[PDB]
Enzyme design. Structure first.
Site, PDB file in Angstrom:
ATOM      1  CB  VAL A 152     -13.965   0.187  -6.771  1.00  0.00           C
ATOM      2  CG1 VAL A 152     -14.231  -0.476  -8.093  1.00  0.00           C
ATOM      3  CG2 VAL A 152     -12.499   0.473  -6.671  1.00  0.00           C
ATOM      4  CG  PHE A 153     -20.559   1.803  -8.582  1.00  0.00           C
ATOM      5  CD1 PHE A 153     -21.364   2.103  -7.530  1.00  0.00           C
ATOM      6  CD2 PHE A 153     -21.131   1.345  -9.718  1.00  0.00           C
ATOM      7  CE1 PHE A 153     -22.708   1.925  -7.603  1.00  0.00           C
ATOM      8  CE2 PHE A 153     -22.476   1.162  -9.802  1.00  0.00           C
ATOM      9  CZ  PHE A 153     -23.265   1.447  -8.744  1.00  0.00           C
ATOM     10  CD  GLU A 176     -12.892  -6.674 -14.522  1.00  0.00           C
ATOM     11  OE1 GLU A 176     -13.260  -7.400 -15.448  1.00  0.00           O
ATOM     12  OE2 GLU A 176     -13.628  -6.361 -13.579  1.00  0.00           O
TER      13      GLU A 176
END
Length: 180
Positions: free
Chosen positions: A10-11, A90
């Protein structure tokens, strides 16, 4: 060295650069392309509050863009669970896969997961002049702290891993806020 059965990275382009809530087996400094990082996202649950929102980063499509950040490798055998944990944190965000280019030339570029806020997101504020954004940041505070703390921390982190030209928008904003 030894090949692993599964892989997921994951960035991190915002707060994840300095603080992480999930477990990880590896991390690398690098960049992604075709997106730019802008303080066009509002914060009502972290660096601001409803009625006095803060400004935090979001990614915008930019064909000439680059975003320097950190990629985190999810633990082998737990990637799907960890992702779910992230997916649940999110509004209307979307995830996409992009090429991540490690700062270290020895490691070959690879695919990473990216979480991007939509226009549809309720907290999206959009573009504004830098002076205004800086003002909003200066005056905003939320459950996680002062907005200024968030900006400074991000700036410190990027600076630590790359030259200031790496992110013009971020550095400029820091300067405006620091002018205080």
């Amino acid at each position: 060295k030894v090949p692993r059965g599964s892989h997921m990275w994951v960035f991190g382009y915002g707060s994840l650069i300095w603080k992480v809530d999930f477990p990880y087996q590896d991390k690398l400094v690098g960049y992604i392309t075709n997106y730019s990082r802008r303080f066009w996202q509002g914060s009502t649950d972290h660096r601001g509050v409803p009625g006095k929102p803060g400004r935090v980063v979001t990614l915008v499509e930019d064909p000439a863009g680059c975003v320097w950040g950190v990629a985190y490798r999810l633990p082998v055998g737990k990637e799907e669970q960890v992702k779910a944990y992230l997916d649940f944190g999110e509004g209307g965000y979307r995830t996409t896969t992009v090429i991540f280019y490690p700062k270290d030339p020895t490691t070959k570029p690879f695919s990473v997961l990216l979480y991007i806020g939509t226009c549809d997101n309720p907290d999206y504020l959009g573009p504004a002049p830098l002076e205004d954004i800086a003002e909003q940041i200066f005056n905003a505070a939320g459950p996680s702290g002062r907005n200024t703390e968030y900006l400074f921390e991000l700036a410190n982190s990027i600076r630590n891993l790359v030259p200031e030209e790496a992110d013009e928008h971020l550095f400029a904003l820091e300067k405006l806020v620091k002018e205080r």
